[PDB]
């Protein structure tokens, strides 16, 4: 699995065990990602914060 990240080169390969791509944003400002990378379990979203997780190459 390959996922997008914030800084150049903008992509990376995930380690064994981290099999999800994720993106964190402010729910009120969906166009600016704050964190972007590989993870093992999807974190809990809240009213103000959203975590999106997916498992297809460069889906995040």
For residues 20-49, which are near its own copies according to CB under 8 A? 24, 26, 28-32, 34-35, 40-41, 43-45, 47-49
For residue 13, the minimal CB distance to its own copies (Å) is 5
Half-sphere exposure of residue 6: CA atoms within 13 angstroms, side-chain side: 9
Number of residues that bind its own copies (CB under 8 A): 34
In 3D space, the residue among 15, 35, 13 whose CA is nearest the CA of residue 52 turns out to be: 35
Give the interface with Cl ion as residue ranges (CB under 5 A).
2, 16-17, 30, 37-38
């Amino acid at each position: 699995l390959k996922c997008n990240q914030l800084i150049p080169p903008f992509w990376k390969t995930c380690p064994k065990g981290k099999n999800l791509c994720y993106k964190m944003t402010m729910r009120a400002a969906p166009m600016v990602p704050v964190k972007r990378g590989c993870i093992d379990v999807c974190p809990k979203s809240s009213l103000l914060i959203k975590y999106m997780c997916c498992n297809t190459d460069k889906c995040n």
